[PDB]
Protein backbone atom coordinates (compact mmCIF):
# COMPACT_ATOMS: atom_id res chain seq x y z
CA UNK A 1 0.00 0.00 0.00
CA UNK A 2 2.03 3.40 -1.42
CA UNK A 3 1.08 6.73 -2.25
CA UNK A 4 1.80 9.14 -4.70
CA UNK A 5 4.64 12.00 -3.29
CA UNK A 6 6.01 14.98 -5.11
CA UNK A 7 9.06 15.01 -6.82
CA UNK A 8 7.43 10.65 -7.46
CA UNK A 9 8.65 10.17 -11.34
CA UNK A 10 5.54 8.45 -13.01
CA UNK A 11 3.85 7.49 -16.45
CA UNK A 12 0.50 7.93 -17.38
CA UNK A 13 -1.30 4.82 -18.78
CA UNK A 14 -4.90 4.42 -20.66
CA UNK A 15 -6.73 1.66 -22.09
CA UNK A 16 -6.58 1.35 -26.15
CA UNK A 17 -7.94 -1.06 -28.19
CA UNK A 18 -5.86 -1.90 -30.54
CA UNK A 19 -5.54 -5.21 -33.34
CA UNK A 20 -8.89 -6.09 -31.50
CA UNK A 21 -7.10 -6.12 -28.02
CA UNK A 22 -6.98 -4.01 -25.28
CA UNK A 23 -3.38 -2.19 -24.78
CA UNK A 24 -1.97 0.29 -22.22
CA UNK A 25 -0.80 3.54 -23.69
CA UNK A 26 2.04 5.90 -22.49
CA UNK A 27 1.05 9.23 -22.11
CA UNK A 28 4.54 11.05 -24.34
CA UNK A 29 6.08 13.84 -25.38
CA UNK A 30 8.95 15.02 -27.20
CA UNK A 31 9.56 19.11 -26.66
CA UNK A 32 12.36 19.80 -29.06
CA UNK A 33 10.75 21.03 -31.73
CA UNK A 34 7.78 20.29 -31.36
CA UNK A 35 4.89 20.47 -28.07
CA UNK A 36 1.98 18.02 -28.58
CA UNK A 37 1.81 14.83 -26.23
CA UNK A 38 1.72 11.61 -28.40
CA UNK A 39 0.86 7.87 -27.03
CA UNK A 40 3.56 5.51 -26.78
CA UNK A 41 2.94 1.98 -26.84
CA UNK A 42 4.41 -0.80 -24.10
CA UNK A 43 3.97 -3.80 -26.21
CA UNK A 44 6.39 -6.58 -27.42
CA UNK A 45 8.66 -5.40 -24.82
CA UNK A 46 10.81 -8.85 -25.46
CA UNK A 47 11.07 -8.22 -28.84
CA UNK A 48 11.08 -4.42 -28.68
CA UNK A 49 12.88 -1.38 -26.18
CA UNK A 50 9.46 0.70 -25.10
CA UNK A 51 10.83 3.95 -24.82
CA UNK A 52 9.80 4.83 -21.89
CA UNK A 53 12.30 8.22 -21.17
CA UNK A 54 9.65 10.54 -23.48
CA UNK A 55 6.62 8.92 -21.43
CA UNK A 56 7.86 9.92 -17.94
CA UNK A 57 6.91 12.61 -15.67
CA UNK A 58 7.85 14.40 -12.45
CA UNK A 59 4.97 15.22 -9.90
CA UNK A 60 6.33 18.74 -9.48
CA UNK A 61 3.54 20.31 -6.93
CA UNK A 62 0.16 19.23 -5.32
CA UNK A 63 -1.99 21.85 -3.84
CA UNK A 64 -5.89 21.95 -2.27
CA UNK A 65 -8.13 24.28 -4.94
CA UNK A 66 7.75 16.13 -0.41
CA UNK A 67 4.24 15.82 0.22
CA UNK A 68 1.32 13.13 -0.49
CA UNK A 69 -0.98 13.64 -3.57
CA UNK A 70 -4.60 13.98 -2.21
CA UNK A 71 -7.76 13.43 -4.40
CA UNK A 72 -8.97 17.18 -5.25
CA UNK A 73 -5.59 18.88 -5.17
CA UNK A 74 -4.04 20.43 -8.56
CA UNK A 75 -1.15 19.02 -9.92
CA UNK A 76 1.76 20.10 -12.15
CA UNK A 77 3.56 17.54 -13.94
CA UNK A 78 7.30 18.36 -15.06
CA UNK A 79 8.17 16.14 -18.41
CA UNK A 80 11.77 15.08 -17.82
CA UNK A 81 12.54 14.46 -21.26
CA UNK A 82 12.24 18.78 -22.00
CA UNK A 83 11.91 19.71 -18.63
CA UNK A 84 8.71 21.65 -19.64
CA UNK A 85 4.91 21.09 -18.31
CA UNK A 86 1.90 18.91 -19.14
CA UNK A 87 -0.55 21.34 -20.34
CA UNK A 88 -3.74 21.86 -22.26
CA UNK A 89 -3.22 24.44 -25.09
CA UNK A 90 -5.70 26.85 -26.74
CA UNK A 91 -5.32 25.08 -29.88
CA UNK A 92 -6.94 22.58 -31.72
CA UNK A 93 -14.58 21.27 -32.09
CA UNK A 94 -14.90 21.22 -28.83
CA UNK A 95 -11.77 19.47 -27.66
CA UNK A 96 -8.07 21.25 -27.37
CA UNK A 97 -4.63 20.33 -27.58
CA UNK A 98 -2.76 18.75 -24.69
CA UNK A 99 1.07 19.56 -24.75
CA UNK A 100 3.92 20.89 -23.53
CA UNK A 101 4.87 24.56 -22.08
CA UNK A 102 7.54 26.18 -20.30
CA UNK A 103 5.35 28.53 -18.64
CA UNK A 104 3.74 27.28 -15.27
CA UNK A 105 2.06 30.91 -14.51
CA UNK A 106 -1.65 30.77 -15.27
CA UNK A 107 -3.61 27.65 -15.00
CA UNK A 108 -3.15 25.97 -18.15
CA UNK A 109 -0.70 23.51 -16.78
CA UNK A 110 -2.62 22.29 -13.60
CA UNK A 111 -4.59 19.33 -13.18
CA UNK A 112 -7.49 18.48 -10.51
CA UNK A 113 -7.05 14.90 -9.71
CA UNK A 114 -10.46 12.82 -9.24
CA UNK A 115 -11.43 9.21 -7.64
CA UNK A 116 -12.65 6.78 -11.01
CA UNK A 117 -15.24 5.86 -8.45
CA UNK A 118 -16.93 6.35 -5.10
CA UNK A 119 -13.81 3.45 -3.66
CA UNK A 120 -12.05 7.02 -3.56
CA UNK A 121 -12.77 10.52 -1.98
CA UNK A 122 -11.93 14.18 -2.03
CA UNK A 123 -9.11 14.46 0.18
CA UNK A 124 -7.98 10.73 0.49
CA UNK A 125 -4.53 9.81 -0.82
CA UNK A 126 -3.79 8.34 -3.82
CA UNK A 127 -2.12 5.11 -4.31
CA UNK A 128 0.04 3.71 -6.78
CA UNK A 129 -2.45 2.02 -9.32
CA UNK A 130 -5.38 3.97 -9.10
CA UNK A 131 -6.86 4.53 -12.09
CA UNK A 132 -7.12 8.75 -12.03
CA UNK A 133 -9.42 11.31 -13.74
CA UNK A 134 -7.84 14.16 -14.78
CA UNK A 135 -8.88 17.86 -15.18
CA UNK A 136 -7.68 20.71 -16.49
CA UNK A 137 -8.22 23.33 -14.44
CA UNK A 138 -8.43 26.59 -16.89
CA UNK A 139 -10.40 24.49 -19.64
CA UNK A 140 -12.48 21.97 -17.30
CA UNK A 141 -11.87 19.42 -20.24
CA UNK A 142 -10.64 15.65 -18.85
CA UNK A 143 -7.32 14.48 -19.95
CA UNK A 144 -8.48 12.04 -23.05
CA UNK A 145 -7.81 9.59 -25.04
CA UNK A 146 -9.87 9.84 -28.40
CA UNK A 147 -9.21 7.79 -31.98
CA UNK A 148 -8.78 9.86 -35.41
CA UNK A 149 -7.17 9.21 -38.56
CA UNK A 150 -7.18 5.60 -37.93
CA UNK A 151 -4.85 6.59 -34.87
CA UNK A 152 -5.44 7.70 -31.50
CA UNK A 153 -4.28 10.75 -30.11
CA UNK A 154 -4.44 12.54 -26.31
CA UNK A 155 -6.65 15.49 -25.94
CA UNK A 156 -8.65 17.57 -23.71
CA UNK A 157 -12.08 16.59 -23.89
CA UNK A 158 -15.53 16.72 -22.07
CA UNK A 159 -15.83 12.65 -22.38
CA UNK A 160 -13.45 10.59 -19.79
CA UNK A 161 -10.64 8.64 -19.89
CA UNK A 162 -9.23 6.26 -16.92
CA UNK A 163 -5.63 6.73 -16.38
CA UNK A 164 -3.80 4.60 -14.42
CA UNK A 165 -0.37 5.98 -13.08
CA UNK A 166 2.39 3.57 -12.76
CA UNK A 167 4.99 4.68 -10.29
CA UNK A 168 8.88 4.83 -12.08
CA UNK A 169 11.18 6.67 -9.35
CA UNK A 170 10.47 7.78 -6.03
CA UNK A 171 12.45 11.08 -5.92
CA UNK A 172 12.25 11.01 -2.21
CA UNK A 173 13.71 7.89 -1.78
CA UNK A 174 16.49 7.59 -4.10
CA UNK A 175 20.04 7.72 -2.16
CA UNK A 176 22.07 10.23 -3.96
CA UNK A 177 25.50 9.00 -5.55
CA UNK A 178 23.75 5.93 -6.90
CA UNK A 179 22.82 4.12 -9.83
CA UNK A 180 18.93 4.51 -10.55
CA UNK A 181 17.07 2.87 -13.79
CA UNK A 182 16.60 5.24 -16.69
CA UNK A 183 19.71 7.45 -15.89
CA UNK A 184 21.99 8.66 -18.41
CA UNK A 185 25.45 8.18 -17.56
CA UNK A 186 29.42 6.71 -18.58
CA UNK A 187 31.29 4.10 -18.01
CA UNK A 188 34.86 4.53 -17.79
CA UNK A 189 38.25 2.24 -16.89
CA UNK A 190 39.24 4.68 -14.84
CA UNK A 191 43.40 3.65 -14.21
CA UNK A 192 43.13 4.10 -18.14
CA UNK A 193 41.24 7.35 -18.50
CA UNK A 194 39.03 5.98 -20.99
CA UNK A 195 35.45 5.21 -21.39
CA UNK A 196 32.64 2.85 -23.30
CA UNK A 197 32.05 5.00 -27.06
CA UNK A 198 31.47 4.70 -30.63
CA UNK A 199 33.25 6.25 -33.72
CA UNK A 200 32.95 9.75 -34.06
CA UNK A 201 30.69 11.87 -36.30
CA UNK A 202 32.64 11.80 -39.16
CA UNK A 203 32.26 8.34 -39.88
CA UNK A 204 28.87 7.03 -41.72
CA UNK A 205 25.63 5.37 -39.54
CA UNK A 206 27.04 1.97 -40.35
CA UNK A 207 30.29 2.23 -39.14
CA UNK A 208 29.26 4.17 -35.78
CA UNK A 209 27.46 0.57 -34.49
CA UNK A 210 31.06 -0.88 -33.52
CA UNK A 211 31.68 0.01 -29.84
CA UNK A 212 35.25 0.56 -28.39
CA UNK A 213 36.90 2.21 -25.32
CA UNK A 214 38.89 5.59 -26.04
CA UNK A 215 40.65 8.08 -23.88
CA UNK A 216 40.93 11.76 -23.93
CA UNK A 217 38.60 14.09 -24.60
CA UNK A 218 35.34 11.38 -25.85
CA UNK A 219 34.70 11.62 -22.23
CA UNK A 220 33.49 14.93 -21.97
CA UNK A 221 31.64 14.80 -25.59
CA UNK A 222 28.13 13.23 -26.02
CA UNK A 223 29.25 9.93 -27.87
CA UNK A 224 29.93 8.37 -24.45
CA UNK A 225 27.00 8.95 -23.08
CA UNK A 226 24.20 5.77 -22.35
CA UNK A 227 21.09 5.40 -20.88
CA UNK A 228 20.63 2.04 -18.62
CA UNK A 229 17.30 1.00 -19.45
CA UNK A 230 15.68 -2.00 -16.92
CA UNK A 231 13.33 -4.66 -18.19
CA UNK A 232 10.61 -3.41 -16.49
CA UNK A 233 7.25 -0.36 -16.55
CA UNK A 234 6.77 0.09 -13.27
CA UNK A 235 9.75 0.95 -10.44
CA UNK A 236 11.94 0.75 -14.21
CA UNK A 237 13.36 4.27 -12.13
CA UNK A 238 14.37 2.12 -8.92
CA UNK A 239 17.71 1.31 -7.52
CA UNK A 240 20.01 -0.41 -10.09
CA UNK A 241 20.92 -3.73 -8.18
CA UNK A 242 23.62 -6.14 -8.79
CA UNK A 243 22.34 -9.28 -11.24
CA UNK A 244 19.10 -6.99 -12.11
CA UNK A 245 18.67 -6.81 -15.90
CA UNK A 246 19.20 -4.05 -18.03
CA UNK A 247 19.34 -2.31 -22.11
CA UNK A 248 21.93 -0.33 -23.20
CA UNK A 249 20.96 2.79 -24.95
CA UNK A 250 23.58 4.76 -26.38
CA UNK A 251 22.33 8.04 -26.57
CA UNK A 252 23.85 10.05 -29.43
CA UNK A 253 22.67 7.05 -32.09
CA UNK A 254 19.78 5.89 -30.27
CA UNK A 255 20.47 2.17 -30.69
CA UNK A 256 21.19 -0.39 -28.17
CA UNK A 257 23.66 -2.61 -27.54
CA UNK A 258 23.82 -6.08 -28.67
CA UNK A 259 25.33 -9.34 -28.94
CA UNK A 260 25.54 -10.63 -32.88
CA UNK A 261 29.45 -13.78 -31.05
CA UNK A 262 30.66 -9.95 -32.12
CA UNK A 263 29.09 -6.43 -29.80
CA UNK A 264 26.71 -4.55 -32.35
CA UNK A 265 24.48 -1.20 -31.52
CA UNK A 266 21.43 -2.19 -33.36
CA UNK A 267 17.86 0.15 -33.71
CA UNK A 268 14.76 -1.02 -31.40
CA UNK A 269 13.55 -2.73 -33.99
CA UNK A 270 15.65 -5.81 -34.14
CA UNK A 271 16.80 -5.21 -30.18
CA UNK A 272 15.09 -8.46 -28.26
CA UNK A 273 15.64 -9.03 -24.92
CA UNK A 274 18.30 -12.14 -24.98
CA UNK A 275 20.66 -10.51 -27.43
CA UNK A 276 20.62 -7.01 -25.48
CA UNK A 277 20.18 -7.74 -21.64
CA UNK A 278 22.88 -7.11 -19.43
CA UNK A 279 23.47 -7.07 -15.73
CA UNK A 280 26.31 -5.27 -13.59
CA UNK A 281 28.07 -7.91 -11.14
CA UNK A 282 30.21 -7.14 -8.23
CA UNK A 283 32.62 -9.33 -9.40
CA UNK A 284 33.02 -12.57 -11.77
CA UNK A 285 33.40 -15.21 -9.19
CA UNK A 286 9.32 -0.32 -5.24
CA UNK A 287 12.92 1.61 -5.18
CA UNK A 288 14.72 -1.74 -3.12
CA UNK A 289 18.15 -1.21 -1.92
CA UNK A 290 20.29 0.90 -3.33
CA UNK A 291 23.63 -1.01 -4.15
CA UNK A 292 25.35 0.19 -7.10
CA UNK A 293 27.53 3.86 -6.36
CA UNK A 294 28.89 6.05 -8.83
CA UNK A 295 32.83 6.66 -8.87
CA UNK A 296 33.11 3.79 -6.37
CA UNK A 297 31.47 0.85 -7.42
CA UNK A 298 33.66 -1.62 -9.37
CA UNK A 299 31.15 -2.78 -11.87
CA UNK A 300 31.62 -5.76 -14.35
CA UNK A 301 28.98 -6.21 -17.04
CA UNK A 302 27.92 -9.08 -18.07
CA UNK A 303 25.62 -10.41 -20.79
CA UNK A 304 22.45 -12.21 -19.39
CA UNK A 305 21.67 -15.00 -21.68
CA UNK A 306 25.29 -15.62 -22.43
CA UNK A 307 26.97 -15.15 -18.87
CA UNK A 308 29.97 -13.56 -21.08
CA UNK A 309 31.88 -10.66 -19.99
CA UNK A 310 32.15 -7.22 -21.42
CA UNK A 311 35.72 -6.93 -21.59
CA UNK A 312 38.17 -5.27 -24.19
CA UNK A 313 40.64 -6.28 -26.85
CA UNK A 314 44.47 -5.31 -26.30
CA UNK A 315 45.80 -3.57 -29.00
CA UNK A 316 48.34 -5.61 -29.94
CA UNK A 317 41.62 1.77 -29.14
CA UNK A 318 40.69 -1.13 -27.49
CA UNK A 319 37.22 -2.37 -29.43
CA UNK A 320 35.01 -3.67 -26.76
CA UNK A 321 34.28 -7.41 -27.08
CA UNK A 322 32.70 -10.37 -24.77
CA UNK A 323 34.76 -13.05 -23.55
CA UNK A 324 33.97 -15.89 -20.66
CA UNK A 325 37.17 -14.52 -19.09
CA UNK A 326 38.44 -11.01 -20.01
CA UNK A 327 41.05 -9.14 -17.93
CA UNK A 328 41.67 -8.68 -14.70
CA UNK A 329 41.71 -4.90 -15.34
CA UNK A 330 37.65 -4.81 -16.84
CA UNK A 331 36.01 -3.73 -14.01
CA UNK A 332 34.04 -0.22 -14.89
CA UNK A 333 33.73 2.97 -12.94
CA UNK A 334 30.14 4.80 -13.06
CA UNK A 335 29.85 8.25 -13.85
CA UNK A 336 26.49 10.12 -13.94
CA UNK A 337 26.32 12.71 -16.65
CA UNK A 338 25.37 16.23 -15.72
CA UNK A 339 21.50 17.13 -16.69
CA UNK A 340 23.44 19.57 -18.88
CA UNK A 341 25.08 17.86 -21.22
CA UNK A 342 22.60 14.80 -21.25
CA UNK A 343 19.72 17.05 -22.15
CA UNK A 344 22.28 18.62 -25.30
CA UNK A 345 23.03 14.83 -26.27
CA UNK A 346 19.38 14.66 -27.32
CA UNK A 347 18.60 17.52 -28.56
CA UNK A 348 21.50 16.87 -30.75
CA UNK A 349 20.11 13.18 -31.80
CA UNK A 350 16.74 14.37 -32.47
CA UNK A 351 18.04 17.51 -34.33
CA UNK A 352 19.99 15.35 -36.72
CA UNK A 353 17.05 12.79 -37.16
CA UNK A 354 14.64 15.49 -38.22
CA UNK A 355 17.38 17.68 -40.31
CA UNK A 356 18.28 14.43 -41.92
CA UNK A 357 14.78 14.16 -43.12
CA UNK A 358 14.62 17.43 -43.96
CA UNK A 359 17.59 16.86 -46.42
CA UNK A 360 16.33 13.63 -47.61
CA UNK A 361 13.25 15.29 -48.83
CA UNK A 362 14.79 18.26 -50.36
CA UNK A 363 16.80 15.47 -52.28
CA UNK A 364 13.41 13.79 -53.57
CA UNK A 365 12.44 17.36 -55.00
CA UNK A 366 15.21 17.18 -57.15
CA UNK A 367 15.03 13.87 -58.10
CA UNK A 368 7.31 13.23 -49.79
CA UNK A 369 8.43 13.79 -46.02
CA UNK A 370 9.80 17.39 -45.95
CA UNK A 371 8.36 18.68 -42.57
CA UNK A 372 8.53 22.31 -42.54
CA UNK A 373 6.27 22.90 -39.85
CA UNK A 374 8.63 20.70 -37.36
CA UNK A 375 12.21 22.21 -39.05
CA UNK A 376 10.90 25.73 -38.63
CA UNK A 377 9.91 25.63 -34.70
CA UNK A 378 13.07 23.16 -34.20
CA UNK A 379 15.56 26.04 -35.32
CA UNK A 380 13.68 28.94 -33.29
CA UNK A 381 13.97 26.47 -30.33
CA UNK A 382 17.89 25.60 -31.48
CA UNK A 383 18.45 29.62 -31.43
CA UNK A 384 16.71 29.91 -27.92
CA UNK A 385 18.95 26.98 -26.83
CA UNK A 386 21.92 29.15 -27.59
CA UNK A 387 20.66 32.90 -26.68
CA UNK A 388 23.39 34.31 -25.60
CA UNK A 389 22.57 35.37 -21.41
CA UNK A 390 20.75 39.01 -21.85
CA UNK A 391 22.85 41.92 -20.44
CA UNK A 392 20.51 42.57 -17.83
CA UNK A 393 20.81 39.29 -15.93
CA UNK A 394 23.00 39.26 -12.54
CA UNK A 395 26.82 38.01 -12.69
CA UNK A 396 26.32 34.77 -11.32
CA UNK A 397 23.25 33.94 -13.70
CA UNK A 398 25.41 35.63 -17.05
CA UNK A 399 28.29 33.59 -15.79
CA UNK A 400 26.24 30.41 -15.52
CA UNK A 401 24.34 30.90 -18.40
CA UNK A 402 27.88 31.43 -20.56
CA UNK A 403 29.39 27.97 -19.07
CA UNK A 404 26.66 25.97 -20.15
CA UNK A 405 26.76 27.68 -23.46
CA UNK A 406 30.10 26.82 -23.93
CA UNK A 407 29.32 23.17 -23.41
CA UNK A 408 26.53 23.39 -25.50
CA UNK A 409 28.53 24.55 -28.85
CA UNK A 410 31.21 21.75 -27.69
CA UNK A 411 28.51 19.48 -27.71
CA UNK A 412 27.33 20.40 -30.89
CA UNK A 413 30.62 20.82 -32.83
CA UNK A 414 31.92 17.47 -31.69
CA UNK A 415 28.99 15.74 -33.41
CA UNK A 416 29.42 17.14 -36.61
CA UNK A 417 26.04 19.46 -36.53
CA UNK A 418 28.07 22.65 -38.09
CA UNK A 419 28.58 20.56 -41.17
CA UNK A 420 24.97 19.14 -40.82
CA UNK A 421 23.49 23.19 -40.87
CA UNK A 422 25.85 23.90 -43.75
CA UNK A 423 24.16 20.53 -45.83
CA UNK A 424 20.65 21.97 -45.12
CA UNK A 425 21.43 25.18 -46.41
CA UNK A 426 23.05 24.00 -49.48
CA UNK A 427 20.03 22.05 -50.26
CA UNK A 428 18.03 25.09 -50.02
CA UNK A 429 20.31 27.51 -52.11
CA UNK A 430 19.50 25.26 -54.61
CA UNK A 431 16.07 27.57 -55.22
CA UNK A 432 16.83 31.23 -56.33
CA UNK A 433 13.60 32.31 -54.88
CA UNK A 434 11.34 31.45 -52.41
CA UNK A 435 8.80 31.64 -55.47
CA UNK A 436 10.72 28.73 -56.95
CA UNK A 437 10.81 26.89 -53.71
CA UNK A 438 7.18 27.06 -53.77
CA UNK A 439 7.01 25.68 -57.29
CA UNK A 440 8.18 23.00 -56.41
CA UNK A 441 7.54 22.20 -52.81
CA UNK A 442 4.12 23.68 -52.16
CA UNK A 443 3.21 27.57 -50.98
CA UNK A 444 3.86 26.78 -47.08
CA UNK A 445 7.15 25.58 -47.92
CA UNK A 446 7.98 28.26 -50.36
CA UNK A 447 6.71 30.64 -47.19
CA UNK A 448 9.13 29.53 -44.81
CA UNK A 449 12.07 29.40 -47.24
CA UNK A 450 13.48 32.56 -46.23
CA UNK A 451 12.82 32.28 -42.59
CA UNK A 452 14.21 28.58 -42.50
CA UNK A 453 17.36 29.81 -44.23
CA UNK A 454 17.63 32.84 -41.95
CA UNK A 455 17.55 30.45 -38.91
CA UNK A 456 19.98 28.48 -39.93
CA UNK A 457 22.60 31.01 -40.79
CA UNK A 458 21.64 32.55 -37.03
CA UNK A 459 22.08 28.84 -35.46
CA UNK A 460 25.51 28.26 -37.33
CA UNK A 461 26.50 32.14 -36.03
CA UNK A 462 25.54 30.89 -32.93
CA UNK A 463 27.37 27.72 -33.27
CA UNK A 464 30.66 29.17 -33.66
CA UNK A 465 30.46 32.74 -31.52
CA UNK A 466 33.12 33.14 -28.74
CL1 LIG B 1 18.02 8.70 -24.75
Not at 93 to 105: C, I, N, P, R
Not at 112 to 134: M, N
Not at 289 to 301: L, N, R
Not at 363 to 368: V, W
Request: some cysteine; hydrophobic content about 35%.
Amino acid sequence: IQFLRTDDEVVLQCTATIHKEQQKLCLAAEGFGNRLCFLESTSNSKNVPPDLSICTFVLEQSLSVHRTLLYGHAILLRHSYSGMYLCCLSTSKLAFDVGLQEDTTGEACWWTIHPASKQRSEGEKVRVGDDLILVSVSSERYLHLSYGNSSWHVDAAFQQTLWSVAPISSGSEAAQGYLIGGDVLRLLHGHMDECLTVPSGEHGEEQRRTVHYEGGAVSVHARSLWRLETLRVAWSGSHIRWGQPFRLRHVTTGKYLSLMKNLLLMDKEKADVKSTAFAFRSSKEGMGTSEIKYGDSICYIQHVDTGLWLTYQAVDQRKAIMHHEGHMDDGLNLSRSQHEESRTARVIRSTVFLFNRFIRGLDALSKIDLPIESVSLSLQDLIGYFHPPDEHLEHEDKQNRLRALKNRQNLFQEEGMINLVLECIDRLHVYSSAAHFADVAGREAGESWKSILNSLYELLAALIRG
